[PDB]
């Protein structure tokens, strides 16, 4: 159908395009973007000395060898503070639906 046809081929490999959903750089979510690299992922975690869930966060190394812990905001930032009752073991099922209980221990 027209000159633009895939009939042409040789001794090489071709990359296939993804349709119906245009992707973005690795620092975008796979659900909305594409090929979302985990290196840029903000996940729920629990601190060591405190016993409160600070919400979504990601470990990152900063200048001088010091490691930082960035954070994000979502779901009012309040439901996660109460999510500690789900990680230690509506506002009760929501804590189980918004996440897959993939909160970081210690």
């Amino acid at each position: 159908d027209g000159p633009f046809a895939f009939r042409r081929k040789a001794g090489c490999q071709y990359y296939a395009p993804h349709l119906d959903q245009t992707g973005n750089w690795p620092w975008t979510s796979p659900k909305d973007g594409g090929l979302g690299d985990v290196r840029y992922r903000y996940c729920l975690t629990t601190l060591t000395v405190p016993q409160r869930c600070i919400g979504f966060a990601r470990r990152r190394v900063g200048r001088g060898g010091r490691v930082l812990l960035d954070r994000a905001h979502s779901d009012y930032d309040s439901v996660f503070h109460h999510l500690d009752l789900e990680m230690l073991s509506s506002k009760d099922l929501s804590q189980i639906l918004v996440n897959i209980k993939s909160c970081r221990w210690r």
Binding site: D1, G2, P3, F4, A5, F6, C12, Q13, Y14, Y15, A16, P17, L19, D20
Partner: protein, 32 residues
């Protein structure tokens, strides 16, 4: 039957003018 056939016909006729089509028929990228 009475109308679906005409719709399918006018869709197939207007499907691809000369190859350009957003849903499919995209030349695959070359590796490097």
């Amino acid at each position: 039957q009475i109308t679906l056939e005409n719709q399918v016909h006018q869709r197939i006729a207007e499907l691809r003018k000369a190859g350009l089509w957003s849903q499919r028929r995209l030349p695959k990228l070359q590796e490097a």
